Design an enzyme around this catalytic site. Structure first.
Site, short mmCIF file in Angstrom:
data_model
loop_
_atom_site.label_atom_id
_atom_site.label_comp_id
_atom_site.label_asym_id
_atom_site.label_seq_id
_atom_site.Cartn_x
_atom_site.Cartn_y
_atom_site.Cartn_z
CG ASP A 1 42.92 40.98 34.71
OD1 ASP A 1 42.84 40.24 33.74
OD2 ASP A 1 42.05 41.85 34.96
CB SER B 1 40.53 38.38 32.41
OG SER B 1 40.67 39.79 32.33
CG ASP C 1 23.73 37.24 36.55
OD1 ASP C 1 22.71 36.78 37.07
OD2 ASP C 1 24.72 36.53 36.27
#
Length: 130
Positions: free
Chosen positions: A49, A51, A102
Site C-alpha cells: 500500500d 507504507s 491518540d
C-alpha cells in the site's frame, strides 16, 4: 544496529515510562516488540500500500512518521521514520506513547492483538532484573 535481549529491552522500556502506561503492564510492550520485530531495531516491512513499518515496534508511515514516500501521510508523531531505526529506543517509545494517547489501544499493533492479548504477558519480564 542492535537486536535486544528480552530483559534488556524490558529494562529500557521501564526506564522510559512504559510500565502501566495507560494501563498496559510492561510485559505487554515487550511481547509486542517480540512479535513485531523479534527485538530488531532495524526491522522494516515494506507494504504494498506504499507504507512501511519501521523499527522495534513496527510503526507505520501512513499515520505516524514521515518517510516522504507514503500517500496520505499524517506524521502524527512528528518524526522522520528513520528515527525509529535507531539503536536507542527513545523515538520508538515516544511515538508508541502518542499512538495510545491518540485514541488507540494496544490493538494498534496487530502482533499484540494476535499473539499477546489474553496471554500471560508477565512471562516476558519474568526472571529479569528490573
Amino acid at each position: 544496529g542492535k537486536v535486544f535481549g528480552r530483559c534488556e529491552l524490558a529494562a529500557a522500556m521501564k526506564r522510559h515510562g512504559l510500565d502501566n502506561y495507560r494501563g498496559y503492564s510492561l510485559g505487554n510492550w515487550v511481547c509486542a516488540a517480540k512479535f513485531e520485530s523479534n527485538f530488531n531495531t532495524q526491522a522494516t516491512n515494506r507494504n504494498t500500500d506504499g507504507s512501511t513499518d519501521y523499527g522495534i515496534l513496527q510503526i507505520n508511515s501512513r499515520w505516524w512518521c514521515n518517510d516522504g514516500r507514503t500517500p496520505g501521510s499524517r506524521n502524527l508523531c512528528n518524526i522522520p521514520c528513520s528515527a525509529l531505526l535507531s539503536s536507542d529506543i527513545t523515538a520508538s517509545v515516544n511515538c508508541a506513547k502518542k499512538i495510545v494517547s491518540d485514541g488507540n489501544g494496544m490493538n494498534a499493533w496487530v502482533a499484540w492483538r494476535n499473539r499477546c492479548k489474553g496471554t500471560d504477558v508477565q512471562a516476558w519480564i519474568r526472571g529479569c532484573r528490573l
